[PDB]
Design a binder for these strands. Structure first.
Ligand SMILES: C[S@@+](CC[C@H](N)C(=O)[O-])C[C@H]1O[C@@H](n2cnc3c(N)ncnc32)[C@H](O)[C@@H]1O
Ligand SMILES: [K+]
Ligand SMILES: [K+]
Ligand SMILES: [Mg+2]
Ligand SMILES: [Mg+2]
Ligand SMILES: [Mg+2]
Ligand SMILES: [Mg+2]
Ligand SMILES: [Mg+2]
Ligand SMILES: [Mg+2]
Ligand SMILES: [Mg+2]
Ligand SMILES: [Mg+2]
Ligand SMILES: [Mg+2]
Ligand SMILES: [Mg+2]
Ligand SMILES: [Mg+2]
Ligand SMILES: [Mg+2]
Ligand SMILES: [Mg+2]
Ligand SMILES: [Mg+2]
Ligand SMILES: [Mg+2]
Ligand SMILES: [Mg+2]
Ligand SMILES: [Mg+2]
Ligand SMILES: [Mg+2]
Ligand SMILES: [Mg+2]
Ligand SMILES: [Mg+2]
Ligand SMILES: [Mg+2]
Ligand SMILES: [Mg+2]
Ligand SMILES: [Mg+2]
Ligand SMILES: [Mg+2]
Ligand SMILES: [Mg+2]
Ligand SMILES: [Mg+2]
Ligand SMILES: [Mg+2]
Ligand SMILES: [Mg+2]
Ligand SMILES: [Mg+2]
Ligand SMILES: [Mg+2]
Ligand SMILES: [Mg+2]
Ligand SMILES: [Mg+2]
Ligand SMILES: [Mg+2]
Ligand SMILES: [Mg+2]
Ligand SMILES: [Mg+2]
Ligand SMILES: [Mg+2]
Ligand SMILES: [Mg+2]
Ligand SMILES: [Mg+2]
Ligand SMILES: [Mg+2]
Ligand SMILES: [Mg+2]
Ligand SMILES: [Mg+2]
Ligand SMILES: [Mg+2]
Lengths: 336, 106, 55
RNA sequence: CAUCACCUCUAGCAUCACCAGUAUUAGAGGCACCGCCUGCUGGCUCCACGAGGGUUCAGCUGUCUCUUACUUUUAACCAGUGAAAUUGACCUGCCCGUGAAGAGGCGGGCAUAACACAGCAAGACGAGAAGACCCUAUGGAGCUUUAAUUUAUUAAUGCAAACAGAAACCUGCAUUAAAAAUUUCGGUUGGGGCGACCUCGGAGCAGAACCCAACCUCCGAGCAGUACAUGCUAAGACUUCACCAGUCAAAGCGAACACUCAAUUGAUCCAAUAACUUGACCAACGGAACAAGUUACCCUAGGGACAGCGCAAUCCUAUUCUAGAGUCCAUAUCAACAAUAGGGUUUACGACCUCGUUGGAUCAGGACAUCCCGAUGGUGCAGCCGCUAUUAAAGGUUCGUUUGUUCAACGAUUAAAGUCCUACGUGAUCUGAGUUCAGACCGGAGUAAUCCAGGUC
RNA sequence: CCUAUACCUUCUGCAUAAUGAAUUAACUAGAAAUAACUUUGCAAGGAGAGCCAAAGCUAAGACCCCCGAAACCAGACGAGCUACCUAAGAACAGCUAAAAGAGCACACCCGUCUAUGUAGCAAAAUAGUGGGAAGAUUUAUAGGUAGAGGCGACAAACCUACCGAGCCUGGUGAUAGCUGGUUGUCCAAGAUAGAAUCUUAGUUCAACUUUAAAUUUGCCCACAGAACCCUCUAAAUCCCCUUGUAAAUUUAACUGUUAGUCCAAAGAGGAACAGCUCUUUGGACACUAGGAAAAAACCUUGUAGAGAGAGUAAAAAAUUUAACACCCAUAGUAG
RNA sequence: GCUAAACCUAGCCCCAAACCCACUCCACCUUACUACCAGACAACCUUAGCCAAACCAUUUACCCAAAUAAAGUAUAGGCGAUAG
């Protein structure tokens, strides 16, 4: 009670994001205050073929499959074996709750379709070892396991409470045989230690640093980052984003790719953090990285997503009334 | 801020103490004392006497069950010639199981 | 604190009236277990009849 | 505050107020005339007026420099009459020390025939009463409200009842509203603001049986999964220092051939159900079936409170060190990192924000770490002035203007306008401000009552 | 001369400059049930209907205070003071002015400033200086409005010298986890783990303590024995036959106590040398005396009387610090 | 040796028993105790609260007509305190 955390979050966003987006902010603000559209991620382990037919009856369309055929039309590719069904532009229809299949696992998972792009931008390949920092609660973690291109995975999140939610998601969806071995490693440790525990170990690293989540902040009243007690954490939040990304960058082997993802529209936490890590590695550890161009990636998914074309390095997906996916920011940088 | 109190776990019957069937010998968080002769183990690693007699503490060679993967993986990495020892608590029975008594002259 | 599981009551099909409460996932079909019935002193089929509460 | 003037709101009417009245009226309110300006309500100007609050010319004067004289009352003595607060007992000294830390009574020294009378106000933490300061109470009361619990009451309606060729009144039962009624403000964190916290598990955490470090620092838990004999019974024991609760368990019947997991939880009453069984972020987690704020109008019962402790950190002073400034040159002077002594101050957790006695008048006592006067070294001391050091407390250390966590700045002088201590030294000698108050506004806070170390009277 | 820091009460500890007491006399404060115990009667029955009984039952004896709130309610009594109103009356010189809520200024009303006074003349006055003084004035008389209220030019003003809700009586010996008090003699045993709590000013349970009873072990303690970790590491503790000793457990009945303080030691509070706060072990103090100057906590010492006997215990600070070379030196050279 | 100090009745308390009083003259509801003129005025209606529940909000004993016993039993009750 007292001062609502929702209004405090909205006040902070209104001042900051009005300048950044200009006339686009009123359009973004309505989408943020409205409920985000949920995409259906079909579980490959379950009856994926049957569920795909079932979703098409509900007028759902696989945008991922459509984006696959657009690669040759426009003229690293992307992570394969991903099937996500969303509705048409401007359709407010919601998917039914997921149900267990004949195999005992949930048939599909409901998640933001904008959160699949960091997995898609990762360009996952078979036989690789994937490190995910802040993997919990498993929005991006499940997508990596759906691909089946990762022989060894390390899912690390600082909060054990979030980690416990991830394991339950893995148990319900991912069959135990995959989780039985050392293929999926779940730990609760600081990600900044990963820059020293395991250096050059992984070929593909996905770093979704903690950040002020615009969708959750404006709606959730529990553990909001904008409450008075969390003000100290918010002030040091940009510092954490620079350190956690740097640890993930050192963790990968040269010739590997690291994707930095953030669920926010703040430039101080999307572009500045990316530039900070690049400078930090050169100054302290003498590490040089190259940020790839995602413009080719953007032009394929323009049909089902709205993109902001005033970003220095990464790609930002802005929410909209017709396409409510977002906000999502992801940048792919490889180590040389 | 978390507040907790001691669990009062430890040795309940020392060396040479006389115990009866069912008496709890020791309560442990982890297997500090292993069950020996005529000593059972409960769910919470609680040691109770299965027979009435005297409690003895000895050092015995620790040979883990083959099914226990963690303990088998430990002995296989030991240098050749090394032997593991652990403290076992035994109950030495004092009374015989029974005696034959004359009941009739038929 | 989302209610993933619910508490259901299994009623014996032997007609003895013996019933017991078990926990099952909400997103699941009605259970049909093979539980011991003390009245007939043997394992009999049981059927879910009514949900008691959401856990 | 009221006040003409202005403005808002309500009311189309009579036989006890309004009113023996009738919208040019009456009532409930705001604001404070007028004049100007403005919106479709707001801002300035200005006549007089004021025991309002400041400022100022001139004069006036004992307000003062700087007090003095006289008269009257009082006073003191003689005669008559004759109270009150107060009072453990007193055969009632001073200086150091000690001490519930401020000694007439204790320790060590010093002083000391006994008694009135008149003065004095340093002490007897002097006396009376009032009040301030917080704190406490499952103590009160006033006020306010979107605190909880209510509509008995009143008003407006509905249906029933009743009349009935129709209608009302009354009554019963419902539904809104009004105005009231009863009751309460859970703890922890110097206070307030903002937040956090209250149960359970683990670690720093008591190194070795058990228990034990509150506050504090840090991370968790309020699940899930596999079973469906996770059946029924029954020796002996453990136990979170009580109880409640919790834990283990041989044998036996019946089957098969005491589940994982550190925490993963909630009593009684009551409610539902044929039985079985189930029900609370009762999270203030041994739980009240359901109750907030405020008081500077406050009340009652009590408790606490300048002075005192402080060999780590920090600050100051004097030495030590001898790097470095001073043309050269450690030491004429100055001085870094530091060290050793004396003194002051800060301090166990929201690695938040703020807030909790002192001048003056009079009279001074004392210290010297000396501002002036005196004596004596060194000088980058020619001489005059200066700088520095030793010695010296006999004596002296001004008058004004603004302003005042009551202190600085400024003006004119002086051989100098010393640093402190003394329960602000000193309020039973006096007085100003603050602590802050009963009234009142301005600014800010709050739905309001009311509040703010803020501004002012 | 020598020795001796009034009493009560409240706190860890009062000579305390914390509370109470001028003093005398009189008055003034522990009321009761179940159970248990003790002593009689009778006894598988007891009792003067009813009730209890697996030795009980009946009777007696023997245990549970005083004063004090602010309040709340009910019914009365009050507007001769005051607030406002009603009825019918009265008063206001002189002067300047004008048909004035005008000016000056008496009577009169009010009470601005200062001083006196402070148990006073006075539970609000006096002297001087002031505001109003033909008006929204002042004032005499009678009447009205009464406490869940009245009245109010709102000051939370006034309503008979304590009005944030009058006074009196009654409920009422209200209640108070709070303060204070608690009255003959003598002896005996007797102090510091905790938990829960609208709780930390309290209470309940446990621990401790007391009395009675029953029973047999209790304390001290020889080995043996009690975990690995994160690599290592303390004083010790538990258990414990002998032995030295005399207690311990259980049964019955209750009350009372609890933040103790300081000293030694080991620690704890963001990795804080002291200090503050908080644990642990031990001691002392809240019990005596002697000694450290006076002295609750240091040291010596505890079982109680009389003696004009004796032997002892602890028990009195050390320290005074700075002399010193004599003689000589040309040169391959400014390597 | 002053002030004083001492005293034993007055009467009262609790029971039993029995059901008590009020016109001498005059005055007395108007301003009571006031000799002496048109009134029309008339009575009846749950107690509450303190307190206990360690707050408080439902609730909380108060002779109702025979001592004893049934019996603090059946019942009632934030199924609490307590009531019966
Ligand atoms: C914004 S969430 C992203 C969740 C997930 N990446 C997804 O999109 O599905 C970021 C999470 O990172 C975790 N986190 C915060 N700090 C971290 C740290 N220092 N190291 C690792 N994880 C951290 C937090 O628990 C938080 O839930
Ligand atoms: K005035
Ligand atoms: K009360
Ligand atoms: Mg006004
Ligand atoms: Mg002036
Ligand atoms: Mg002048
Ligand atoms: Mg003269
Ligand atoms: Mg005389
Ligand atoms: Mg007297
Ligand atoms: Mg004398
Ligand atoms: Mg003294
Ligand atoms: Mg003396
Ligand atoms: Mg004096
Ligand atoms: Mg006094
Ligand atoms: Mg209390
Ligand atoms: Mg109140
Ligand atoms: Mg126990
Ligand atoms: Mg509570
Ligand atoms: Mg509690
Ligand atoms: Mg507990
Ligand atoms: Mg005020
Ligand atoms: Mg001189
Ligand atoms: Mg000197
Ligand atoms: Mg002056
Ligand atoms: Mg002046
Ligand atoms: Mg004085
Ligand atoms: Mg004295
Ligand atoms: Mg004292
Ligand atoms: Mg006295
Ligand atoms: Mg009441
Ligand atoms: Mg009360
Ligand atoms: Mg009158
Ligand atoms: Mg006039
Ligand atoms: Mg006049
Ligand atoms: Mg008036
Ligand atoms: Mg007012
Ligand atoms: Mg007021
Ligand atoms: Mg009065
Ligand atoms: Mg009393
Ligand atoms: Mg109390
Ligand atoms: Mg004794
Ligand atoms: Mg003797
Ligand atoms: Mg020589
Ligand atoms: Mg009560
Ligand atoms: Mg109360």
């Amino acid at each position: 009670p007292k001062f609502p955390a929702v209004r405090l979050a909205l006040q902070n966003f209104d001042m900051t994001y009005s300048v950044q987006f200009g006339d686009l902010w009123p359009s973004i603000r309505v989408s943020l205050l409205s409920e985000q559209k949920y995409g259906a991620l079909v579980n490959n382990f379950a009856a994926w073929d049957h569920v795909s037919a079932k979703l098409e009856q509900l007028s759902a369309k696989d945008f991922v499959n459509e984006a696959i055929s657009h690669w040759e039309l426009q003229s690293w590719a992307c992570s394969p074996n991903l099937r996500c069904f969303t509705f048409d532009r401007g359709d407010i229809s919601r998917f039914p709750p997921a149900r267990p299949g004949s195999l005992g696992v949930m048939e599909y998972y409901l998640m933001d379709a904008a959160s699949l792009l960091p997995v898609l931008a990762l360009g996952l390949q078979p036989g690789d070892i994937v490190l995910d920092l802040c993997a919990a609660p498993g929005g991006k973690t499940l997508a990596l396991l759906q691909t089946g291109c990762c022989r060894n995975l390390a899912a690390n999140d600082l909060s054990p409470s979030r980690i416990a939610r991830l394991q339950k998601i893995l148990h319900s969806y991912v069959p135990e045989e995959i989780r039985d071995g050392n293929q999926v490693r779940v730990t609760s440790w600081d990600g900044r230690k990963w820059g020293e525990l395991e250096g050059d170990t992984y070929d593909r690293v996905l770093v979704d640093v903690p950040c002020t989540t615009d969708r959750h902040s404006l709606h959730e009243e529990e553990n909001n980052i904008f409450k008075r007690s969390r003000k100290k954490e918010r002030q040091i939040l940009p510092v954490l984003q620079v350190q956690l990304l740097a640890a993930g960058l050192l963790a990968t082997k040269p010739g590997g790719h690291v994707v930095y993802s953030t669920c926010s529209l703040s430039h101080l936490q999307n572009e500045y953090v990316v530039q900070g890590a690049i400078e930090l590695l050169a100054n302290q550890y003498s590490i040089q990285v190259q940020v790839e161009d995602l413009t080719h990636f953007r032009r394929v998914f323009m049909d089902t997503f709205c993109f902001f074309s005033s970003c220095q390095v990464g790609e930002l997906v802005i929410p909209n009334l017709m396409a409510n996916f977002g906000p999502m920011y992801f940048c792919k940088m490889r180590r040389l | 801020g978390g507040k907790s109190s001691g669990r009062r776990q430890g040795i309940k019957k020392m060396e040479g103490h006389y115990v009866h069937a069912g008496n709890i010998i020791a309560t442990q968080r982890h297997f500090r004392w292993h069950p020996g002769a005529h000593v059972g183990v409960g769910k919470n690693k609680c040691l109770y006497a299965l027979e009435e007699g005297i409690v003895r503490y000895t050092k015995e060679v620790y040979v883990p069950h083959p099914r226990n993967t963690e303990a088998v993986d430990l002995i296989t990495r030991l240098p050749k010639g090394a032997v593991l020892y652990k403290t076992f608590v035994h109950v030495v029975p004092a009374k015989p199981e029974g005696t034959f008594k004359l009941v009739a002259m038929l | 604190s989302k209610s993933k599981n619910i508490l259901v009551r299994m009623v014996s099909e032997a007609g003895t009236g013996f019933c017991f409460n078990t926990k099952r996932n909400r997103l699941r079909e009605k259970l049909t277990l093979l539980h011991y019935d003390p009245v007939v002193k043997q394992r009999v089929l049981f059927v879910e009849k009514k949900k008691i509460r959401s856990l």
